[PDB]
Design a protein around this nucleic acid. Sequence first.
RNA 1: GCUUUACUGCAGGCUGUCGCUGAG
RNA 2: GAUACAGGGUGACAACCCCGUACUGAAGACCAGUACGCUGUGCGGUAGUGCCAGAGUAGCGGGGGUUGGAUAUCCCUCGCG
RNA 3: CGCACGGAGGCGAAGAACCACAGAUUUCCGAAUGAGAAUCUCUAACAAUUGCUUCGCGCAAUGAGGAACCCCGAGAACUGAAACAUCUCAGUAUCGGGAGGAACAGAAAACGCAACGUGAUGUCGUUAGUAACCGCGAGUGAACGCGAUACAGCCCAAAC
Lengths: 46, 56, 194, 65, 81
Amino acid sequence: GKKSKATKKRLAKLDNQNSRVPAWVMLKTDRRNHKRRHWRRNDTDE
Amino acid sequence: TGAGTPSQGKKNTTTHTKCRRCGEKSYHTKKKVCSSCGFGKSAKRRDYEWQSKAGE
Amino acid sequence: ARSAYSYIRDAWKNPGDGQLAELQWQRQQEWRNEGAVERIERPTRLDKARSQGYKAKQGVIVARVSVRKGSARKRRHKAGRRSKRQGVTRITRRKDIQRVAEERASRTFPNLRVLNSYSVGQDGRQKWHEVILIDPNHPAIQNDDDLSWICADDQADRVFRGLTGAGRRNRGLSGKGKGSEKTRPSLRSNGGKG
Amino acid sequence: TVLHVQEIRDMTPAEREAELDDLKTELLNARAVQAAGGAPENPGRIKELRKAIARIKTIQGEEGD
Amino acid sequence: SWDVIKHPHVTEKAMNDMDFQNKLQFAVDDRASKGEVADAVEEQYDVTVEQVNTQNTMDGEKKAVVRLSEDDDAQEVASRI
RNA sequence: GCUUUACUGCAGGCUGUCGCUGAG
RNA sequence: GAUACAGGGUGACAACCCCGUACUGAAGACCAGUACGCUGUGCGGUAGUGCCAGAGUAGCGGGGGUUGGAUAUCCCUCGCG
RNA sequence: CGCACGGAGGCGAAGAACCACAGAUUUCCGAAUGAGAAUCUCUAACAAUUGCUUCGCGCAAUGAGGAACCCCGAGAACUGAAACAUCUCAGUAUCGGGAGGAACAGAAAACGCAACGUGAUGUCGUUAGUAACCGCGAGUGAACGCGAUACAGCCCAAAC
Ligand SMILES: [Cl-]
Ligand SMILES: [Cl-]
Ligand SMILES: [K+]
Ligand SMILES: [Mg+2]
Ligand SMILES: [Mg+2]
Ligand SMILES: [Mg+2]
Ligand SMILES: [Mg+2]
Ligand SMILES: [Mg+2]
Ligand SMILES: [Mg+2]
Ligand SMILES: [Mg+2]
Ligand SMILES: [Mg+2]
Ligand SMILES: [Mg+2]
Ligand SMILES: [Mg+2]
Ligand code: NA
Ligand code: NA
Ligand code: NA
Ligand code: NA
Ligand code: NA
Ligand code: NA
Ligand code: NA
Ligand code: NA
Ligand code: NA
Ligand code: NA
Ligand code: NA
Ligand code: NA
Ligand SMILES: [Sr+2]
Ligand SMILES: [Sr+2]
Ligand SMILES: [Sr+2]
Ligand SMILES: [Sr+2]
Ligand SMILES: [Sr+2]
Ligand SMILES: [Sr+2]
Ligand SMILES: [Sr+2]
Ligand SMILES: [Sr+2]
């Protein structure tokens, strides 16, 4: 499949949203990424 | 051929995509119409009274 | 003495007699070859136009609208319906041809507001009505002590809400007493029984 | 912090346009040191550089360039 | 309004292009053309750009590979900034 | 759901009449 | 203490520890570009005069819908007027 | 120096934080309006429909949204009738069009406790399950008046 520029920006964003909650937020809140999406297990849009 | 599992293999067509207007994955790229907000069909937004209970 | 206007009025009392009979036979031939909504410079019935509110001023538009003759153009039921609700042929609409005309006119002119309308005849298959429309944005009207009322925000799209004289007459609002129990103040307030 | 509102209004339209390009270059060169993952940084200055550019642009609108 | 050059792209592959091919890599704005990237680099750094190669990265940004002339040295330009 | 000379109706077709529609 | 014993907070049951609470006062919004006031215009009465006063209307008939509307609801449609 | 109690660093007596009002900025798609397009792209744009008009997009209008309420149109069936067709459910559900901060109505070709009487219109209480309708079955169902609320009355066409 051939992706467009906008489709690429969205996929790019979804990949960034897939990073873990930083180590410092755990210490600041004194103690979970609920939007964890896998390439196989989960499904994106379009 | 079974209508079940062996007919699922042919399913690689892309139809419903992210809509420019509402953001929902309902823009039918072959019909150029959105099944959620009515983009491509109407200037007005697709809303219906049956989307909620009669007295609500 | 009699006005010149009173002669146009007296002629239209019998549109099938006299000079008007020949005038209609001629004019309708040109009208049948015209559109659905045709803007005209001057009203065919000056007396009636002036009587209804027309002034030879800026922002006062007149247009002739032709709507089809007869009952409802209805589709037959594609689902289960009891004998009573199985009709197609004898069903007529609750809005008169004059109102369908006024609406078609106001849609052709999305900036103007309907003041009134009047009949200008019919042949065997269609009816003609001329509609007086007003520009609420033109200062020639915003300063007119006789027509400035139509510039108010609440007069926006007045024909579609039945605020026209043809609207109010069709809504059964003519009588102030007996027979108007289910019509006044609105049909909707009386549970749609008018 | 180093650049105040009164000091930008004392400046002439050409001095602001000159100070804008000076701050944009100090910002680009701060972002460059951040791109390399450098240690001799100052996290509070890169924050102020953006606010200062906003202030000069707000004064440019207020004065009519 | 948007600025053309966002920040320099400094990675291992970016250094190889700088040391051996005299190429400076930049993360630019995705609405910028090859010509607009060339001009902005010649203005912000005082160099002569020969060729620009653009790629729309999987980061939502646009990466531009800018080759300088023989008169200019990419290693010397990246060291001052 | 389906059938028909089941009950009752509804489209549709045919036909008269009125309007469009006029001169001798 | 109290014109303040409403409520909350505070390491356990608090009028008097803290915010508040009564009392007094301030501002904004709505009422409302309204009321009142003003400016201007000019109300009215007698006699004479068949000068003027909204048509497919009032109304009648065929067919329908609607209504409690029954002969006596309201509306649409075709014809006539 | 948000949620958010980290680290580094920073800002604040040049009165920061914070709050109120006002203003600046305000990407792209979106009624979406130069043209096209799954939020991007291609070569000056009120696209389209209108009014005015210097007849030039010059000046303007419309479009779409909003919890429900409001107004104008289209309009079921399950159900009840212990079946069912008129009737009922119901002018309900749902659909089309449209306005406002409220809508609609409204100064009598009224009423008709018939009078030597009332006096624009909504709404509330009542009149009343009364009159009226109805396989006169099941069911359906007003009004005048009265007591209240609030009150407000005017402009054309024509005559000259
Ligand atoms: Cl209108
Ligand atoms: Cl009375
Ligand atoms: K039924
Ligand atoms: Mg990754
Ligand atoms: Mg049934
Ligand atoms: Mg009401
Ligand atoms: Mg490329
Ligand atoms: Mg009925
Ligand atoms: Mg476009
Ligand atoms: Mg039953
Ligand atoms: Mg029975
Ligand atoms: Mg009923
Ligand atoms: Mg009565
Ligand atoms: Na997947
Ligand atoms: Na209109
Ligand atoms: Na970056
Ligand atoms: Na069956
Ligand atoms: Na009739
Ligand atoms: Na009725
Ligand atoms: Na904003
Ligand atoms: Na416009
Ligand atoms: Na123009
Ligand atoms: Na039963
Ligand atoms: Na049965
Ligand atoms: Na019945
Ligand atoms: Sr899978
Ligand atoms: Sr296939
Ligand atoms: Sr379409
Ligand atoms: Sr809708
Ligand atoms: Sr409008
Ligand atoms: Sr990456
Ligand atoms: Sr009269
Ligand atoms: Sr009164």
